[model samples]
Target chain A: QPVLTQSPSVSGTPGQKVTIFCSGSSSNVEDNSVYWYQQFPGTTPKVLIYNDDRRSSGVPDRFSGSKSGTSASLAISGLRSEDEADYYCLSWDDSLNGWVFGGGTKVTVLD
Target chain B: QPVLTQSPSVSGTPGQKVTIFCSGSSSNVEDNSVYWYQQFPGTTPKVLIYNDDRRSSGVPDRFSGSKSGTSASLAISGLRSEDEADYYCLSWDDSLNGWVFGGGTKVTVLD
Candidate 1:
């Protein structure tokens, strides 16, 4: 059901910032690029950041993605209630010869 | 980005078969390979099939995928209650130069 590993959940107060870390391996993360998706309950996922660092068109500047060695990070700054959703990291797994998704990190914005 | 369309829901009894259809257009489905994902409630989606018909590692043979012009379909044979989940179809959109996913389909194993 997964490849990359991520925290089960993370929470932050409004206006605060938080980062969700995704751990991968050399075959999947270090070799191929990574993509980040924002998913809301009962909705199709939308790409938040593509190619690790580039923000998809119309994505808010508050969200950013970065990759290093075998891990990737998605950072959300100035968080809002609307930002409370699941974040996932996706990449092509060279070992599996297919795409893989992280277990997902649920972000909660608290009062 | 291109919008992929899918049926809202489908149902079948255990041991029966069901097929969920995903429709796109020439810019996406006709050119790029399609991927199918299975998502259980409160969990990250997993790769069910990729490259149109290739099943991902560890996916059961009961799950199969197919494609025709501008369309793709995922079929579940010998259906089980555990197969009750949301399914999504994904493909690259050449016209939009990005990735897109179909509105997810929910499968219910009828009692």
Candidate 2:
């Protein structure tokens, strides 16, 4: 399967907002749903947004997601210092029988 | 809402094998597609499985996956020291239109 595209880094001031994009093929993102995750520098990745626009338990309401065609977007609003981390998007491929992910997006929160 | 749980860590000798568990709720893992990922210390996460049982390219044959009910399992055979890394499982939640992942399981290789 082809790879998903994402920005290497993104930044925003505290209390502001930022959006990361995950671009893929018609089969992987356009027609498929997109999920987002958060990963600290040395920790496991956690669920943030799923199916393009829902939050997992404990996730703040400031984090939102949206999808358009093969492109998906994750927006973190009311950003806090703790929001500085990496984000990833995932999807399944029936033909390959495997999941695919974006390279990842690193968020930096400036004071 | 669903959560994917996994072992904190597992240790195995080289050339041996180890299996990691990924359990979730019926809304997520049970009868849902499961995917596996391998993450080294500072690199990006790589896909290992999708739809419960399938292998991704570049992944060794030793790495296998399966699912039953609300649980998914990732098994690595003929383990190499290089296999010492964190593994994670993922699935889709139709309600969220996104993917969910296991907490993450760390694999430690012993000589």
Candidate 3:
């Protein structure tokens, strides 16, 4: 599996914009699109963004994704208390035919 | 882009078996490999499946995965309290860039 790396944690104030990044090689992020997921406490993890740009059904416009040169990012704007959760990035390595994930980033929505 | 869905949460007794289900469009899961993941609090998500039914290192044989058409399932046998965590399924689209993931399933150990 490709080695994907991410920041451990981040904090943002309400109504602010926060970005979390995922980095890897062309075989994972640059050559491919990155997917993002949200995991709130006591709830199931959900796909909020896919292919580094599109939002899944019911995902608020506050969330966006972009990628460049083996690096991908998920940005959330107009953040709210509910946005305080853990986020994860995912991609597949063609050479290993295995899926890899980032260490995960915790988004702390501050007041 | 294909959409994936999963149950919100489930609970199984220790030493019992629990199965999590993921369903999506025929274009994704049916035509691609279904992967599973284990996510714990404050830790990176671990891969449990790559090409469906493949177990990663340290993954006990008790954790089994399977796919049929647009649906995939991850079954855990002889479950332990430590097995209580979040489970997710992932797949890719034909574009070779976009990937899909189930909302996730939370498995709790029932006393």
TM-score, each model?
Answer: 0.50, 0.48, 0.49
Q: Please give, for residues B44-109, the per-residue lDDT of candidate 1 as tens digits.
A: 889999999999998888999976456677878677989989999999999989999998988767
lDDT of each: 0.79, 0.72, 0.74
**After superposing candidate 3, which stretches have Cα over 4 Å from the reference?**
B1-111
Q: lDDT (0-100) at residue B88 of candidate 1?
A: 96
Tell me model 2's lDDT, rounded to 2 decimals: 0.72
lDDT of 1 by residue, A39-98 (tens): 999998899998989999999989999775566778787789999898999999898999
Looking at model 3, residue B44 earns an lDDT score of 99
Candidate 1: lDDT of A33? 86
Segments in model 1 whose C-alpha atoms lie over 4 Å from true places: B1-111
Q: Write one digit per residue (lDDT tens) for candidate 3, span A2-111.
A: 26765455555678666666766557766676899999888999998888889999999889887654566787867799898989999887766778787787766655
Q: What DockQ does candidate 3 score?
A: 0.02
DockQ of each: 0.02, 0.02, 0.02
> Per-residue lDDT for A1-111 in model 2, tens only?
326666555445667656666766556866677889999988888999887788888998899887654566777767899998988898985555678888786676666
User: Which pairs clash in model 3?
Assistant: A30-A70
Give the total clashing residue pairs for model 3: 1
Candidate with more favorable, higher lDDT: 1 or 3: 1
Query: What is model 1's DockQ versus the real complex?
Result: 0.02
Model 3 C-alpha lDDT per residue in residues B16-102, reported as the tens digit of each score: 655556765546776789899999977899998779888889888898887544556687767788988989898986654579888
